């Protein structure tokens, strides 16, 4: 894989790929991701951080926006407590091996120019579109607040992207990013990462849903979570165990089993794994055993540093 293919690997879309190729030619390029700070950092976060690390390996300067004001607007609590969750997230991201600059949103998002741009964009953005943009992001609320529609307009504020060539986020961000594509004065390449399925297979992985493996989970804990996880024989779609295998594991993968079940299996790619599992040659228990043990090893250094 050249740089472009490394970056493209395991993303859901790049907007646009011709734009990304132009960016890669530059000496200096920057990529941004924002996160509302989360009390637990989970594999969904890790997947994206891994992508920022790809970008870093591709010579991008990395910026992590600790989106405290956004989290505030999205009902995650008071700013001071959010910022301390932010500082913890920074430690986790550093433990994952990311080399980045960290910025707290509230550092600049209360500046007069930033605020003026919020209001200018507020004039340009329909309520309907703002609300549509937040469907996968907004905290559940029986009586949606004005804060909900301020959030996306802040996210499209041009002062977040000045000197940034690439923005990365989950596919949940795509409607907001489409807003930005249309409104931003200077185009920024969007790279969208896939959204992991929840361990119970019931919806998307999320902090509020308690359906994820946190990167600092004890090995006992990871094993129990994976043991209970949705993982029907033969089915790859919406199978979180297969997702973990696709997104986190290295190949060739050596799947240890009893000789009773075929004995050790060596698989040279995720697509190879996909065919075996789909053909019912690899049973969920062994796939889970392998995924849990490889995942524990993957996360070990991170859990260890957070010690
Ligand atoms: N919308 C992202 C947070 C975010 C992302 C990007 C900016 Br700019 C501001 C905030 C959230 O879902 O984590």
From Swiss-Prot:
GO terms for biological process: tyrosyl-tRNA aminoacylation. Residues 151-158 are annotated as: Tyrosine. Its EC number is 6.1.1.1. It holds the Pfam family tRNA-synt_1b. It is found in: Cytoplasm. GO terms for molecular function: ATP binding; tyrosine-tRNA ligase activity. GO terms for cellular component: cytoplasm. Catalyzes the attachment of tyrosine to tRNA(Tyr) in a two-step reaction: tyrosine is first activated by ATP to form Tyr-AMP and then transferred to the acceptor end of tRNA(Tyr). This is Tyrosine--tRNA ligase. The lineage of its organism: Archaea, Methanobacteriati, Methanobacteriota, Methanomada group, Methanococci. The gene is tyrS.
């Amino acid at each position: 894989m050249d740089e472009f293919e490394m970056i493209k690997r395991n993303t859901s879309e790049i907007i646009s790929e011709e734009e990304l190729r132009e960016v890669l030619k530059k000496d200096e390029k920057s990529a941004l991701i924002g996160f509302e700070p989360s009390g637990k950092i989970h594999l969904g976060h890790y997947l994206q951080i891994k992508k920022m690390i790809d970008l870093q390996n591709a010579g991008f300067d990395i910026i992590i926006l600790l989106a405290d004001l956004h989290a505030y607007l999205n009902q995650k609590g008071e700013l001071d407590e959010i910022r301390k969750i932010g500082d913890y997230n920074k430690k986790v991201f550093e433990a994952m091996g990311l080399k980045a600059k960290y910025v707290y949103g509230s550092s600049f998002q209360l500046d007069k120019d930033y605020t003026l741009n919020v209001y200018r964009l507020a004039l340009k953005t329909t309520l309907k579109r703002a609300r549509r943009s937040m469907e996968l992001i907004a905290r559940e609320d029986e009586n949606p607040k004005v804060a909900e529609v301020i959030y996306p307009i802040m996210q499209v504020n041009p002062l977040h992207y000045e000197g940034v060539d690439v923005a990365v986020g989950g596919m949940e961000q795509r409607k907001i990013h489409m807003l930005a594509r249309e409104l931003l004065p200077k185009k920024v390449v969007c790279i969208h990462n896939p959204v992991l399925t929840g361990l119970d297979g019931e919806g998307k992985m999320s902090s509020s849903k308690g359906n994820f493996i946190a990167v600092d989970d004890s090995p006992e804990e990871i094993r129990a979570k994976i043991k209970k996880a949705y993982c029907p024989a033969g089915v790859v779609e919406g199978n979180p165990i297969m997702e973990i295998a696709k997104y986190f594991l290295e190949y060739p993968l050596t799947i240890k089993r009893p000789e009773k079940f075929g004995g050790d299996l060596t698989v040279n790619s995720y697509e190879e794994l996909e065919s075996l599992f789909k053909n019912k040659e690899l049973h969920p228990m062994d796939l889970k055993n392998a995924v849990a043990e490889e995942l524990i090893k993957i996360l070990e250094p991170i859990r260890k540093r957070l010690l």
